[PDB]
Design a protein around this ligand. Structure first.
Ligand SMILES: [Cl-]
Ligand SMILES: [Cl-]
Ligand code: NA
Ligand code: NA
Length: 129
């Protein structure tokens, strides 16, 4: 599924991401825009052989099992394919674990380079939340 900006904001809000670990909603929307262009089916392969999955581009080196990333962990305890669902629950629940791991949203390189230090509230302006 390709979400609209406000539709995604609402879904993330219902799933408890608004101010989760002090990151306001616009941060999560901004990260999703630049990671996946709001497409839940996005995948991208990394040089190390790991793959990033879903709206928030969660990596198979640490967080999910795809059966093809040798020596990897599965800290969210989920198949990576679950991250591609139109239902964002699994992505959101895993993202809460990642953002809690010490580095905050800096775990998402697109957030650090494209969102951090910008007016992120612009990403939810106009939305009915
Ligand atoms: Cl694997
Ligand atoms: Cl980037
Ligand atoms: Na994801
Ligand atoms: Na893995």
């Amino acid at each position: 599924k390709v979400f609209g900006r406000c539709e995604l904001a609402a879904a993330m809000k219902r799933h408890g991401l608004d101010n989760y670990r002090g990151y306001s909603l616009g941060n999560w929307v901004c990260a999703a825009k630049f990671e996946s262009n709001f497409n839940t089916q996005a995948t991208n392969r990394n040089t190390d052989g790991s793959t990033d999955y879903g709206i928030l581009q969660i990596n198979s080196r640490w967080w999910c099992n795809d059966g093809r990333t040798p020596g990897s962990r599965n800290l969210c305890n989920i198949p990576c394919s679950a991250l591609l669902s139109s239902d964002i629950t699994a992505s959101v629940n895993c993202a809460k674990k990642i953002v809690s791991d010490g580095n905050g949203m800096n775990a998402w390189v697109a957030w650090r380079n494209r969102c951090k230090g910008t007016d992120v509230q612009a990403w939810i302006r106009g939305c009915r939340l």
